[PDB]
Design an enzyme around this catalytic site. Structure first.
Site, PDB file in Angstrom:
ATOM      1  N   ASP A 189      -6.603 -43.368  18.421  1.00 27.06           N
ATOM      2  CA  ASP A 189      -7.759 -43.611  17.567  1.00 27.06           C
ATOM      3  C   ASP A 189      -8.598 -42.335  17.470  1.00 27.06           C
ATOM      4  OD1 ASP A 189     -10.032 -44.521  16.270  1.00 27.06           O
ATOM      5  OD2 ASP A 189     -10.813 -45.580  18.015  1.00 27.06           O
ATOM      6  N   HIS A 345     -12.025 -36.590  24.326  1.00 27.34           N
ATOM      7  CA  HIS A 345     -11.053 -36.078  23.378  1.00 27.34           C
ATOM      8  C   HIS A 345     -11.315 -34.589  23.205  1.00 27.34           C
ATOM      9  CE1 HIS A 345      -8.514 -39.134  21.574  1.00 27.34           C
ATOM     10  NE2 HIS A 345      -9.516 -39.995  21.634  1.00 27.34           N
ATOM     11  N   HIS A 379      -5.893 -39.003  24.784  1.00 25.92           N
ATOM     12  CA  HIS A 379      -4.878 -39.792  25.489  1.00 25.92           C
ATOM     13  C   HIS A 379      -3.671 -38.876  25.390  1.00 25.92           C
ATOM     14  CE1 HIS A 379      -7.254 -43.437  25.328  1.00 25.92           C
ATOM     15  NE2 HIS A 379      -7.413 -43.267  24.028  1.00 25.92           N
ATOM     16  N   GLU A 404       1.003 -43.205  22.414  1.00 20.96           N
ATOM     17  CA  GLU A 404       0.227 -44.354  21.975  1.00 20.96           C
ATOM     18  C   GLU A 404       0.891 -44.905  20.724  1.00 20.96           C
ATOM     19  OE1 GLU A 404      -4.146 -44.299  21.689  1.00 20.96           O
ATOM     20  OE2 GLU A 404      -4.064 -46.162  20.546  1.00 20.96           O
ATOM     21  N   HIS A 406      -0.203 -47.974  19.310  1.00 23.27           N
ATOM     22  CA  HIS A 406      -1.106 -49.080  19.028  1.00 23.27           C
ATOM     23  C   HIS A 406      -0.825 -49.903  17.762  1.00 23.27           C
ATOM     24  CE1 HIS A 406      -5.578 -50.425  19.661  1.00 23.27           C
ATOM     25  NE2 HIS A 406      -4.744 -51.442  19.545  1.00 23.27           N
ATOM     26  N   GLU A 449      -2.511 -47.814  25.110  1.00 21.53           N
ATOM     27  CA  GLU A 449      -2.235 -48.857  24.129  1.00 21.53           C
ATOM     28  C   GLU A 449      -0.833 -48.823  23.513  1.00 21.53           C
ATOM     29  OE1 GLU A 449      -5.924 -48.007  21.717  1.00 21.53           O
ATOM     30  OE2 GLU A 449      -6.753 -49.678  22.847  1.00 21.53           O
ATOM     31  N   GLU A 525     -11.636 -47.458  30.448  1.00 18.24           N
ATOM     32  CA  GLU A 525     -12.598 -47.374  29.350  1.00 18.24           C
ATOM     33  C   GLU A 525     -13.629 -48.492  29.514  1.00 18.24           C
ATOM     34  OE1 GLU A 525     -10.800 -47.161  25.429  1.00 18.24           O
ATOM     35  OE2 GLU A 525      -9.053 -46.091  26.203  1.00 18.24           O
ATOM     36  N   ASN A 585      -9.198 -45.811   5.976  1.00 14.62           N
ATOM     37  CA  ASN A 585      -9.916 -45.128   7.043  1.00 14.62           C
ATOM     38  C   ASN A 585     -10.784 -46.144   7.769  1.00 14.62           C
ATOM     39  OD1 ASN A 585     -12.916 -45.054   6.150  1.00 14.62           O
ATOM     40  ND2 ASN A 585     -11.787 -44.427   4.302  1.00 14.62           N
ATOM     41  N   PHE A 589     -16.125 -45.411  12.994  1.00 16.53           N
ATOM     42  CA  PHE A 589     -15.570 -45.774  14.287  1.00 16.53           C
ATOM     43  C   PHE A 589     -15.034 -44.598  15.104  1.00 16.53           C
ATOM     44  CE2 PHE A 589     -15.114 -49.132  17.102  1.00 16.53           C
ATOM     45  CZ  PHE A 589     -13.888 -49.077  17.760  1.00 16.53           C
ATOM     46  N   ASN A 592     -18.247 -42.421  18.959  1.00 17.62           N
ATOM     47  CA  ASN A 592     -18.614 -43.317  20.057  1.00 17.62           C
ATOM     48  C   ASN A 592     -19.059 -42.495  21.261  1.00 17.62           C
ATOM     49  OD1 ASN A 592     -15.260 -44.226  19.426  1.00 17.62           O
ATOM     50  ND2 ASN A 592     -16.981 -45.122  18.300  1.00 17.62           N
TER      51      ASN A 592
HETATM   52  O1  LIG Z   1      -9.495 -49.308  23.381  1.00 17.91           O
HETATM   53  C1  LIG Z   1      -9.897 -48.294  22.891  1.00 17.91           C
HETATM   54  O2  LIG Z   1     -11.203 -48.231  22.439  1.00 17.91           O
HETATM   55  C2  LIG Z   1     -11.816 -47.033  21.817  1.00 17.91           C
HETATM   56  C3  LIG Z   1     -12.656 -47.496  20.623  1.00 17.91           C
HETATM   57  O3  LIG Z   1     -13.508 -46.438  20.180  1.00 17.91           O
HETATM   58  C4  LIG Z   1     -10.745 -46.014  21.368  1.00 17.91           C
HETATM   59  O4  LIG Z   1     -10.053 -46.518  20.214  1.00 17.91           O
HETATM   60  C5  LIG Z   1      -9.755 -45.811  22.525  1.00 17.91           C
HETATM   61  O5  LIG Z   1      -8.845 -44.756  22.209  1.00 17.91           O
HETATM   62  C6  LIG Z   1      -8.958 -47.091  22.767  1.00 17.91           C
HETATM   63  O6  LIG Z   1      -8.210 -46.944  23.969  1.00 17.91           O
HETATM   64 MG   LIG Z   2      -5.780 -47.084  19.979  1.00 17.32          MG
HETATM   65 NA    NA Z   3     -13.225 -45.183  18.271  1.00 16.34          NA
END
Ligand SMILES: O=C1O[C@H](CO)[C@H](O)[C@H](O)[C@H]1O
Ligand SMILES: [Mg+2]
Ligand code: NA
Ligand SMILES: O=C1O[C@H](CO)[C@H](O)[C@H](O)[C@H]1O
Ligand SMILES: [Mg+2]
Ligand SMILES: [Mg+2]
Ligand SMILES: [Mg+2]
Ligand SMILES: [Mg+2]
Ligand code: NA
Ligand code: NA
Ligand code: NA
Ligand code: NA
Ligand code: NA
Lengths: 1011, 204, 193
Positions: A189, A345, A379, A404, A406, A449, A525, A585, A589, A592
């Site tokens: 992400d 990141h 990640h 990943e 996901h 993920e 997380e 997109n 998001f 964060n």
């Molecule tokens: O679970 C998660 O939550 C975050 C949301 O910002 C982000 O996507 C991380 O990479 C993911 O592991």
């Molecule tokens: Mg993800």
């Molecule tokens: Na995010």
């Protein structure tokens, strides 16, 4: 062959992975870690051409430079140079899901470089090229001849160019494919970019070379004795005169040295490794490494002949520390860790995913300064310099494989398929072979993920087998599968369970004691910091401190993934998902972080700093008890400062040096303090100051603080009788009050204070009215995907109930004259579709002193979603430069995020009373406020407030901060009550019950007067 | 059911199997075997191959099978017959009473092997009683032991049939040939004939 | 690309492994394990030619039967037909130990088969070919077009030929290499064929 659409081919002609090499031909240079003449950087200006697909690339490009090409800087992501758009999507793959195939229109970046190579490099030895990071796949040519292929955007790909180069001018041609089968394992992400974004360099190694070395440190029970074991591997012809010497250095002092010829011990029926040797060195009373005190030694590995002739030397920093899980606890050097971590990141607002030393150092300093001692490489393996810095500055690192998936359905569709085992194994094995010697890395992660598949169990076991010194963890498939030594859930809550089918997120306290569970729990997380967040953060830390097996976690996350764009004027602004024409997109998001993209702190950072303090305090009588949470160091750079003030006014203060051993306690008796004269509340505020500068902080740095209410003396003194009596003027349309050159006008139609005059100057642009809503926060909106319309989210429930549409209906509005004042009594009903949502009853009492006492009693229908706030708002006609207040501050703070704030007298410029969140929303609030001063106005009581040039309506309707415009006057929001901001996660309601305005009947009072 | 992986000729034996670069090629020989034969009731134990020493790749594939198919124990003899890659102690030619303390990979007498400190797994020889030529002397000793010790659960004799090939003489009559009879060199001669029965299945 | 000297490439275009299939179109036959019309055997007489190295194989062979070739029975080990000698070595590799490389003189067996395929098989569904055992590596062609590659001598290699076959006569061409990087994982004490 289309090797980029085959998970069976992850590389061609690529050299084996290994620890950082520099091929020093001088041992002292290796010892001091100075530049190596054998390691050249090829970073700089390169030639670059962009193509829509690999089939559009002209054959001539291999032989010579394309005139249509531009000269650009490398490393870099080509999206940052404008060639194509960077895409921000969270879960959904940027390409059609059809493994192992990728789009035929596959953005192709053709990089080429003409450079010189000294004849000395070709007459002997091996010359290899190293690409630290190429996203996401690429083919290599040297002087027109094909060399090799490589995948995995986060680890180096090395190739032997010995047979390709010539003395003099040489040209490289690199065809980087944006998409490949590797893209299926890189669905993190974050922004989706591409190109040669990490360093490119040439390394010259002799033919007879050190091809690999592993450093291990084992200890006796009390860590008073250590054995440093170094296994060395070599390539080239074995000779009996060859030797390997390993020496250990402590500063400029040589601690130990050992020499031996090649030939390892017997392994099995066929013998041992004739091309390997293991040196074991004894070390007494080693200085141990930890985040607290990052003690480091330097190991130099020399390959040489018996007659003393050096062939080459490699080296690394060595940290003596042991990591092990015992009886359910993660221990470092025998002590139970408490992880104050954060996911981070590799992101820069201008350069994208290209990392530089300055930015890395800036992040680390800010992290340690805010009490963080650990980082998770979310990640993927990071730039090689990151580990070196974490070793030296001291931060525990979770090194994570670049895997990943996901967007797959189910998440483990690829990771449970053996056909994908090979591609996955390389992302895990080549990470370990590269970073295994770094002491900062204490835990290995199998990725993120990708659900839980059999491929995970295999690789988990592979790590445990090749490196027993570090625990392995992985959250996929439920956070407690057989592929993890640590229960590492994401966003699992403290007390509340989220019983999702198959992969439930139990409250962390409950998770620990499930029948049969014994492992420690560290959230990979938690406390999602999207926008105005981190509400409830203190709840996590109270739990972490009470439960031995709850050993912390990593906040999500460090820095906003926003990018800089420039308007017509050339002025920069922060952009997020969808601002580059990228679609689909997931918009905002990607932001964060605890800090903005340029590293400016978000208000939430201070809350984290406070909760993660290494010193705890308890007050008993005159005794302050200080407990150290450090595991290894005594407080040898700390002094405690205390202060007692009566409602902001200082009465006494002092300071005592701190002298507490790790895990110890110190009792500090405060001197007898003269009881205050006037009425008010006494407040004690203590803080730990580090007098001396350190590698990570300046002298005077504040590392912790705490407050306590002391004695309070309620005011019983009756105010002197007023001189004049306000006069009431009753008309058909109004109720006006006169007193001196002051005037108050109450509209008998609306029932609200429409205007107030001081002389002849109006004080309001908009009447004073109740307000039960707020510009929705990221947490109120609750979406991780722009395509999801969640009815359960707070904002949706508020809209559906008509809170944003509610309109006041006057139920009562009378006026009475008292013996020394005028009393205006009103009553309003807020309705939506024939449903009474809120009922507000007020009384305004203006006396001879020019003070207006406002009493507000609100009723909230029980079957309507609990309101965002209960207060009043108005647009003050005036604009001042400063904002002064007696309450919690100085920074923005909300009900469920105010532990870091301190009650005191604060004074800041108007601008600081507004938080520039990229995605606008309610902001700048301050709680526990007893007095607010602005211009000639003063409000008193017990309230929360925010004041700025932006109305809740504008913030609510503007998606980007740079599009906000200062409104005439000043918008003031004073709340008797305000709902929590939440944050446990930002894709479901997260405001804890205790912070929801569910009482039904509320009461608050505010006195408004001239100052 | 045994994976087609044997790297006996390497020095040391685990040179390739402890090398991640060979993990892929190895995983395909194990995973594709399991996916093909997992439905056969006759297969009761999976084997990671033969004489490839013991490398990290073995531990990885060992766990992969345990994860995808928990219905069958996994065994492997490389690296000492009792490594972390086997649910069964499965030595080859370990003797009944006599220890053979080879360095690193000792072959303890099977009775002693069972009781070593911390050992608890059953013991079944993947190979024993080498039937090369006039052999099988002492066979009865193994069975008396198998019957007396509960955890000694038998073994697999080496082996079933001589690997001799048919050649013809001047008269065109057939004769049994072995290593070196085809001009193949180097070769290990008669060592290919260790069966309980001749190549034509006639009993020894 | 010399795929037989790269442990990173153990197959090209090979279908996933799975339990024995017969694709019955009648349940009663599936219950009784009777022969299935959807599972055809290609065992029998094939065309074979021996070459000292893969570099000696004439391109003509890909689309036309070599007149020098003989008709032989398949399955079979070519050493048993006398094309070259079977080798018996216990521990010592029959090739120079220099992974992942094999001798340049790599005995190559060129198999080919002209066979029929009914339009009913091509009009609908998938038609795949199955090689239960090829020692030790091979490249597959169908009607002159390259199909795939495979390693591991003791498990089946399957390939989808749906897009390479035509109604009527078809010709397979299989180039089997005696030595490959897979040979390094097949050092069992037995005859080397
Ligand atoms: O679970 C998660 O939550 C975050 C949301 O910002 C982000 O996507 C991380 O990479 C993911 O592991
Ligand atoms: Mg993800
Ligand atoms: Na995010
Ligand atoms: O140890 C062994 O002994 C036998 C000797 O004939 C044969 O070589 C087996 O394959 C090998 O595993
Ligand atoms: Mg590929
Ligand atoms: Mg507090
Ligand atoms: Mg190959
Ligand atoms: Mg053998
Ligand atoms: Na704890
Ligand atoms: Na101190
Ligand atoms: Na907004
Ligand atoms: Na028994
Ligand atoms: Na034998």
């Amino acid at each position: 062959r289309r090797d980029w659409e085959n998970p069976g081919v992850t590389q061609l002609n690529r050299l084996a992975a290994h620890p950082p090499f520099a091929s020093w031909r001088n041992s002292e240079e290796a010892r001091t870690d100075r530049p190596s003449q054998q390691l050249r950087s090829l970073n700089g200006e390169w030639r670059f051409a962009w193509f829509p697909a690999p089939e559009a690339v002209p054959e001539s490009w291999l032989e010579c430079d394309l005139p249509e090409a531009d000269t650009v800087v490398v490393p870099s992501n080509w999206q940052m140079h404008g060639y194509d758009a960077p895409i921000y999507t969270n879960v959904t793959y940027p390409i059609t899901v059809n493994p192992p195939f990728v789009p035929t229109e596959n953005p192709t970046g053709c990089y080429s470089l003409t450079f010189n190579v000294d004849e000395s490099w070709l007459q002997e030895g091996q010359t290899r090229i190293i690409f630290d990071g190429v996203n996401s796949a690429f083919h290599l040519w040297c002087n027109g001849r094909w060399v090799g292929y490589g995948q995995d955007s986060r680890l180096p790909s090395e190739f032997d160019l010995s047979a390709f180069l010539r003395a003099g001018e040489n040209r490289l041609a690199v065809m980087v494919l944006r998409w490949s089968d590797g893209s299926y394992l890189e669905d993190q992400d974050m922004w989706r970019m591409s190109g040669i974004f990490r360093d490119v360099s040439l390394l010259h190694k002799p033919t007879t070379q050190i091809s690999d070395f592993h450093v291990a440190t084992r200890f006796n029970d009390d860590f008073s004795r250590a054995v440093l074991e170094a296994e060395v591997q070599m390539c080239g012809e074995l000779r009996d005169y060859l030797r390997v010497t390993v020496s250990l250095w402590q500063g400029e002092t040589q601690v130990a040295s050992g020499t031996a010829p090649f030939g390892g011990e017997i392994i099995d029926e066929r013998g041992g490794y004739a091309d390997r040797v293991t040196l074991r060195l004894n070390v007494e009373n080693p200085k141990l490494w930890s985040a607290e005190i990052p003690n480091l030694y330097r190991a130099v590995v020399e390959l040489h002949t018996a007659d003393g002739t050096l062939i080459e030397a490699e080296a690394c920093d060595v940290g003596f520390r042991e990591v092990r899980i015992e009886n359910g606890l993660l221990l470092l050097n025998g002590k139970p860790l408490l992880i104050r971590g954060v996911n981070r990141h590799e992101h820069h607002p201008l350069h994208g995913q290209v990392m530089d030393e300055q930015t890395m150092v800036q992040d680390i300093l800010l992290m340690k300064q805010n009490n963080f001692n650990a980082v998770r490489c979310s990640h993927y393996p990071n730039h090689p310099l990151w580990y070196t810095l974490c070793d030296r500055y001291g931060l525990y690192v979770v090194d994570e494989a670049n895997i990943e998936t996901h967007g797959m359905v189910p998440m483990n569709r690829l990771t449970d398929d053996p056909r994908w085992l090979p591609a996955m194994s390389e992302r895990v094995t080549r990470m370990v072979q590269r970073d295994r010697n770094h002491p900062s890395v204490i835990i290995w992660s199998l990725g993120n993920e990708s659900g839980h598949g059999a491929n995970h169990d295999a690789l988990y076991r592979w790590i445990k087998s090749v490196d027993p010194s570090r625990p392995v963890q992985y959250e996929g498939g439920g956070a407690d599968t057989t592929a993890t030594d640590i229960i590492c859930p994401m966003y699992a809550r403290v007390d509340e369970d989220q019983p999702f089918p198959a992969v439930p997120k139990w409250s962390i306290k409950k998770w620990l004691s499930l029948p049969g569970e014994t492992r420690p729990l560290i959230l990979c997380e938690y406390a999602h910091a999207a926008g105005n967040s981190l509400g409830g953060f203190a709840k996590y830390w109270q739990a972490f401190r009470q439960y031995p097996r709850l050993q912390g976690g990593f906040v999500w996350d460090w820095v906003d993934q926003s990018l800089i764009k420039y308007d017509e004027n050339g002025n920069p602004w922060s952009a997020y998902g969808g601002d580059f024409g990228d679609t689909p997109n997931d918009r905002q998001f990607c932001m964060n972080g605890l800090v903005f993209a340029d590293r400016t702190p978000h208000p939430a950072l201070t809350e984290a700093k406070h909760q993660q303090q290494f010193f705890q305090f308890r007050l008993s009588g005159q005794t302050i008890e200080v407990t150290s949470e450090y595991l290894f160091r005594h407080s040898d750079n700390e002094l405690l400062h205390w202060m007692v003030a009566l409602d902001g006014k200082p009465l006494a203060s002092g300071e005592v040096p701190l002298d507490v051993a790790p895990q110890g306690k110190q009792l500090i008796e405060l001197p007898e303090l003269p009881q205050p004269e006037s009425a008010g509340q006494l407040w004690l505020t203590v803080r730990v100051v580090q007098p001396n500068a350190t590698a990570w902080s300046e002298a005077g740095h504040i590392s912790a603080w705490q407050q306590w209410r002391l004695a309070e003396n309620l005011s019983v003194t009756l105010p002197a009788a007023s001189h004049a009596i306000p006069h009431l003027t009753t008309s058909e349309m109004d109720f006006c009050i006169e007193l001196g050159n002051k005037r108050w006008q109450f509209n008998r139609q609306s029932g609200f204070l429409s205007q107030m005059w001081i002389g002849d100057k109006k004080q309001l642009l908009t009447p004073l009215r109740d307000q039960f809503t707020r510009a929705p926060l990221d947490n109120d909106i609750g979406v991780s995907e722009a395509t999801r319309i969640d009815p359960n989210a707070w904002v949706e429930r508020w809209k559906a109930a008509g809170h944003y549409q509610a309109e006041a209906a006057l139920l009562q509005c009378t006026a009475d004259t008292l013996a020394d004042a005028v009393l205006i009594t009103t009553a309003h009903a807020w309705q939506h579709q024939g449903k009474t949502l809120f009922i507000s009853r007020k009384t305004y009492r203006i006396d001879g002193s020019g003070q207006m006492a406002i009493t507000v009693d609100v009723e909230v229908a029980s079957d309507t979603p609990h309101p965002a706030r209960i207060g009043l708002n108005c647009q003050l006609a005036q604009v001042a430069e400063r904002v002064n207040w007696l309450g919690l501050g100085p920074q923005e703070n909300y009900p469920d995020r105010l532990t870091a704030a301190c009650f005191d007298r604060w004074d800041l410029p108007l601008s600081d009373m507004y938080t520039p969140y990229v995605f606008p929303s309610e902001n700048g609030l301050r709680c526990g406020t007893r007095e607010l001063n602005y211009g000639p106005h003063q409000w008193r009581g017990d309230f929360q407030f925010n004041i700025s040039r932006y109305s809740q309506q504008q913030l609510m309707e503007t998606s980007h901060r740079h599009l906000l415009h200062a409104e005439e006057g000043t918008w003031l929001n004073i709340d008797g009550f305000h709902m929590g901001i939440g944050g446990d996660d930002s894709w479901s309601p997260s405001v804890s019950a205790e912070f929801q305005l569910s009482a039904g009947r509320y009461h608050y009072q505010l006195v408004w007067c001239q100052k």
